[PDB]
Amino acid sequence: AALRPLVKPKIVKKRTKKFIRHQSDRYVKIKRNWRKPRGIDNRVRRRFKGQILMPNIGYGSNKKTKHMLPSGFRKFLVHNVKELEVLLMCNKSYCAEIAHNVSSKNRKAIVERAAQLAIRVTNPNARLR
Amino acid sequence: CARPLISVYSEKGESSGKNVTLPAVFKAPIRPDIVNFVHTNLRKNNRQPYAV
Amino acid sequence: GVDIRHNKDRKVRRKEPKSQDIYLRLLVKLYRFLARRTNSTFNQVVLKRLFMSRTNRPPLSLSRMIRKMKLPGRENKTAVVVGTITDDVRVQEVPKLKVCALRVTSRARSRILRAGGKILTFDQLALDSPKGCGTVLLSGPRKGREVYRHFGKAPGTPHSHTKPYVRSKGRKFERARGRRASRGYKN
Amino acid sequence: PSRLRKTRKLRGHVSHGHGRIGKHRKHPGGRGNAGGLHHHRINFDKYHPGYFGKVGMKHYHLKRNQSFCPTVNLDKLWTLVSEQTRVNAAKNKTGAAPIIDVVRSGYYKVLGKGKLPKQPVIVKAKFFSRRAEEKIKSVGGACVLVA
Amino acid sequence: TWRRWHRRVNTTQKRYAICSALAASALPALVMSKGHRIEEVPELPLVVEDKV
Amino acid sequence: SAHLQWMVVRNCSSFLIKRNKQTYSTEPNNLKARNSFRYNGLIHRKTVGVEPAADGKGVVVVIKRRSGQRKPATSYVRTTINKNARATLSSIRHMIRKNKYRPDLRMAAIRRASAILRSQKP
Amino acid sequence: MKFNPFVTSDRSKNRKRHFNAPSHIRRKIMSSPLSKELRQKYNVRSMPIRKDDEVQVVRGHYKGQQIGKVVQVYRKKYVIYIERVQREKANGTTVHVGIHPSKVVITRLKLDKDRKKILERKAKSRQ
Amino acid sequence: LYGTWRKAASLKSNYNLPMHKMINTDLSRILKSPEIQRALRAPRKKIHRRVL
RNA sequence: GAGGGCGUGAAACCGUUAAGAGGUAAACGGGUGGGGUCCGCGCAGUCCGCCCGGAGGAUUCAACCCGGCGGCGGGUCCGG
RNA sequence: CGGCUACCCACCCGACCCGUCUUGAAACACGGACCAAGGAGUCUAACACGUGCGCGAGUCGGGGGCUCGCACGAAAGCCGC
Ligand SMILES: [Mg+2]
Ligand SMILES: [Mg+2]
Ligand SMILES: [Mg+2]
Ligand SMILES: [Mg+2]
Ligand SMILES: [Mg+2]
Ligand SMILES: [Mg+2]
Ligand SMILES: [Mg+2]
Ligand SMILES: [Mg+2]
Ligand SMILES: [Mg+2]
Ligand SMILES: [Mg+2]
Ligand SMILES: [Mg+2]
Ligand SMILES: [Mg+2]
Ligand SMILES: [Mg+2]
Ligand SMILES: [Mg+2]
Ligand SMILES: [Mg+2]
Ligand SMILES: [Mg+2]
Ligand SMILES: [Mg+2]
Ligand SMILES: [Mg+2]
Ligand SMILES: [Mg+2]
């Protein structure tokens, strides 16, 4: 009930697991980021059933529903008033997102200018007094 | 490729009557990738080596 | 599976020109528009030669560009060259012919303007001939390159005439075994 | 540029572009031109014929200084002097001919080619060929030897 | 210490890059896209008097 | 030379925020945020832009003079319109339609003026 | 911009010479500005501070209208100590607060014949 | 110091202005000129999508 | 929450508290279910932008013209 | 009320521990107790091929010289009898 953007369909991602790396559970020296195994005996590379799944081209989301927030916009980050006012033309599909290093004194001015220009901000009530 | 006339400005900012024809260097072609190539090589020329 | 054949996805082709020349990209845009909108196979071949590289566009020479117009039927036609037309030290007389090429050298432009011809560029050639009527498209001596004279099935096995690599062409450098019958075998 | 290097792309692959089976260690075939006759004969032969043996006489203390004779052709014979010179010298005046000296240009021997027009000239050189001398006689010029 | 630091450029390409840079300095859109404030500035390349 | 200016400005400029998302010009004389060729206020010989007024009431319109190039102190002529949104929308419609001046980007100027008149009133 | 090639712009060399300068250099380092009426009366920008100079502090925890006489000048610590400026410890013992002499406005100098010669050289060089 | 395309540079020895690849380079003027639009096929703007 | 090897203070490992579980050694992939922390909102009550027919109010231009500067366009290529 | 998720648990099915020598590895083949930091195709010379740019029967100042002393100037500009 804030800004109510345009016609955005049922957004699907075709799987929502952000695939884990093999043997990341067994060793805590291994970060959970994916890394393609190139072993000569590895069951993950051999694609046995019951093992983990490798991320390939088939998991690509639809181009209409690509980079889509669940609210219905696409995010764009903003540092100041000029980068907020560049969103004056496409405010009904592209929302604002204030950077983390922006202080509260300028953050309240940025969110006030976004409320004037009717631009959606993802974090409206954060880092306030 | 015509050569126009650019007025000469005084110390106050008013256009003087002295008009000089624009030279052909400003009508010469513009190759920013060749500028980037020669600029890269002169930057490589413009340095002390570094520690060994 | 469906395709029992091999998978050759892209044939050979170069779609976009690899050069970052802005003027060459604008000429690629213009002749791409003419090639897809004029039904002119001349514009097709000129657009392909603009896609073609720097090396495979050899420099045309002034004597060859005279002699390909000296043939009967090429009186008022314009010699279109995708590539450079250079000076020739051999020539003595230059006719009143028209030139449409990229990057004609300074002495060549000087002698053509003294002889009374008219040099153009590709945008002026497109303004004068969209379909390319009244043009003769020329190309240069590729096989006379120094690189192509090392190329063959072998350097010397049926004597092969294909120029083995060596530092100094002369005595004591690759002239003994396999080059004469008195010292071992002979090719 | 290390960012355009194949090594930056091949990070992650185990054997790094040189195979697991063959195991390229240090120098498997030798060093340099090792085995020119024994076991690399199909690469020294069949790609460099003539590499082994003596060829002829041995000139002790040779210089590339006594055999200095840069050759000029009959095509290059005209542009050693300017075109204004030959035009204003052969613009229908008389039977006079300009002298084209190749020694001042830095060339010693005149060789024979084609493309020698009707207008005769006088060529001074230290050496000639019989074909170039016949071409000069055919176009009507004069041959002058210098030293 | 014997890395190939300094890179020679052809002088024709050096003069080509100088001519291209001086020609691109004349267009207002290029210099405004580089970011110089040319709002209230008078006519392109500015020529001042010999008293300056 | 406008196509040369576009082929130079379309990269390596002090604009064109290519930061993890779509490209924005931000282009201090512009009508749409997309860094495109048909929507560009520095390169073309004829350029249109609308901006908020400095007094806080009304919309200013900056249009290129086209009578003098390479002279940016007089190259942009400005006007200040303060009307009841329909008279000024019809005014910018007549100013773009009834002249030869930029038959393209009609809807760009109209949508930006309408959006800024919505954003200016409360 | 630095033009003489016999002086450093190096941060390490400048900090080395600054934190290892001898005492006659540290006297020039620990220089203090003057009040506006005293610089109008003497035609000089700043003077090195000594034991018997009266001091108004402009910046810090103690600021303004606190004209007092200094007692100690640790040139090892780059710190002058002022008699008026006090701070109590835990056990009720007072101690002087460390004040850097560049944040120090001198209101009264010490009269000496050597300082008259120094002030005359300052005025003659300022011209 | 550089010269026009008619004369050489008088201060430098053997420098001239470079070859200009596209003389009248207004691509919009060329593509909207009547000589080019006289020789065009037809504006084919139909889409002809997939038929179920 | 900077207390004399004292800026920031992670992992391996240990102690306590909270939640959950335990015969097939622990751990994993696909699919759901249950619980908990947290997030957005008010949960039988949440949609906007335009046009037109109705009800009160205050305004001033617009429709046509006079007055005015600035910009677009083309003809005599008029004066240069 | 809704919520996929780097939270926990249960259930059905599948699932031997990674890396490499090997024709063949889960192997009763070898290395690995765990964790943090460092850690391996670089540089020079030469050649060949491909590509990009400049000039083009020519091309190249890398060797020196010229400018007023300049932080960037150990740069850059120029030589041409
Ligand atoms: Mg295997
Ligand atoms: Mg299939
Ligand atoms: Mg395949
Ligand atoms: Mg591989
Ligand atoms: Mg091998
Ligand atoms: Mg140092
Ligand atoms: Mg600590
Ligand atoms: Mg701390
Ligand atoms: Mg600190
Ligand atoms: Mg901890
Ligand atoms: Mg418990
Ligand atoms: Mg082995
Ligand atoms: Mg075995
Ligand atoms: Mg194995
Ligand atoms: Mg064993
Ligand atoms: Mg084992
Ligand atoms: Mg072990
Ligand atoms: Mg590490
Ligand atoms: Mg090459």
Residues 3-22 of F with CB under 7 A from strand I: none
Q: Is A41 exposed, middle or buried (0-12, 13-18, 19+ CB in 10 A)?
A: exposed
Helix axes C22-37, C41-51, angle to 10 degrees: 150
- Element spanning F115, H or E: helix F106-120
For strand I, give the nucleotides within 7 A of a protein CB.
11-13, 26-31, 40, 46-48, 51, 61-62, 70-73
What is the whole-number distance in angstroms between the Cα of residue D19 and the centre of ligand 5?
A: 8
Please tell me the number of Cα atoms within 13 Å of A7 on its side-chain side: 0
Chains contacting H with at least 3 CB pairs below 8 Å?
B, C, E, F
Of C142, C132, C140, C133, the closest CA to residue C46 belongs to C132
What angle is formed at CA F118 by the lines to CA F113 and CA F122, rounded to 5 degrees?
A: 140
Q: Which CB contacts under 8 angstroms, 24+ apart, belong to A17-22?
A: A19/A52, A19/A53, A19/A54, A19/A55, A20/A52, A22/A51, A22/A52
Among chain C residues, the shortest Cα distance to F10 is held by C22
Q: CB within 8 A of A31, min separation 6: which ones?
A: A21, A24
Using alpha carbons, select from G48, G27, G70 the residue that is nearest to residue G115. G48
A128 CB neighbours strand I below 7 A: no
The nearest alpha carbon in chain B to E12 belongs to B38
H15-CA/J63-C1' distance, Å: 23
H-helix segments, C2-121: 22-37, 41-51, 62-70, 106-115
Decide: F66 and F29 in contact? Cβ < 8 Å.
Answer: no
Name the nucleotide nearest A25; use CA and C1'.
I27
CB of residue F65 closer than 7 A to nucleic acid strand I?
yes
Q: Measure, in angstroms, how far nucleotide I14 C1' is from residue A28 CA.
A: 17
- CB H15 to CB E15 under 8 A? yes
d(CA B9, CA B20): 11
Residue C152 gets which letter from DSSP?
S
Question: Rounded CA gap, C132 and C40, in Å?
Answer: 7
Q: Determine if strand I comes within 7 Å of the CB of A31.
A: no
Q: Using CB atoms, which residue from F13, F43, F75 is nearest to E34?
A: F13
User: What is the Å distance from ligand 6's center to G10 Cα?
Assistant: 6
Yes or no, beta carbons of C92 and D76 under 8 Å apart: no
Write b or e for each residue in C118-147: b if 16 or more Cβ atoms lie within 10 A of its Cβ, otherwise e. eebbbbbbbbbbbebeebbebbbeeeeeee
Query: Are the Cβ atoms of B30 and F8 closer than 8 angstroms?
Result: yes
Are D144 and D122 in contact, with CB atoms under 8 Å apart? Answer: yes
Q: Integer distance in angstroms from the first to the last C-alpha of chain A? A: 25
DSSP state of A98: E
- Rounded CA separation C71/C57 (Å): 23
Q: Which of C149, F13, C180 is nearest to E27 (CA)?
A: F13
Cβ-defined contact of D12 to A36 (cutoff 8 Å): yes
**CB-defined contacts C:H, below 8 A:** 50
Spatial CB neighbours of D113, under 8 Å, sequence gap ≥ 6: D73, D74, D75, D132
Technique behind the model: cryo-EM
Rounded to the nearest angstrom, the distance between the alpha carbon of A31 and the centre of ligand 11 is: 29
Do the bridges between strand C135-138 and strand D99-101 make them parallel or antiparallel, or are there none, so unpaired? unpaired
Distance (Å, whole) CA F38 – CA F26: 15
A53 touches strand I (CB under 7 A): yes
- The three-point CA angle D130-D135-D140 to 5° equals 125
- Interface contact A63, partner F, CB < 8 A: no
Cα of C147 vs centre of ligand 19, distance in Å, is 10
E strand residue ranges, chain B: 5-9, 15-21
Task: Output the CA D32–ligand 5 centroid distance in Å.
Answer: 16
Is residue F121 less than 8 Å (CB to CB) from chain A?
A: no
Amino acid at A96: A
Q: Measured between beta carbons, which residues in chain F are less than 8 angstroms from residue C123?
A: none
Between CA D57 and CA C169 the distance in angstroms is 16
Class of residue G42 by CB neighbours under 10 A (exposed 0-12, middle 13-18, buried 19+): middle
How many Å from the CA of C33 to C1' of I59? 58
E44 near B3, Cβ under 8 Å? no
Task: Say whether residue H18 is in contact with chain E using an 8 A CB cutoff.
Answer: yes
Q: Is B28 on the interface with H (CB under 8 A)?
A: yes
Element (H, E) at G55: strand G54-57
Give the minimum alpha-carbon distance from C126 to chain H in angstroms, rounded to a whole number.
8
For chain F, how are helix, strand and coil distributed in percent, rounded to 5?
30, 15, 55
Report the C-alpha gap between B31 and G105 in whole angstroms.
60
- Separation of A50 CA and I23 C1' (Å): 26
Distance from CA of F85 to the nearest CA of H (A): 35
Q: Is F87 near strand I, with its CB below 7 A from some atom of it?
A: yes
C142 touches chain H (CB under 8 A): no
Selected for mutation to probe chain E from B3, B11, B14, B31 (highest E CB count within 10 Å) is B31
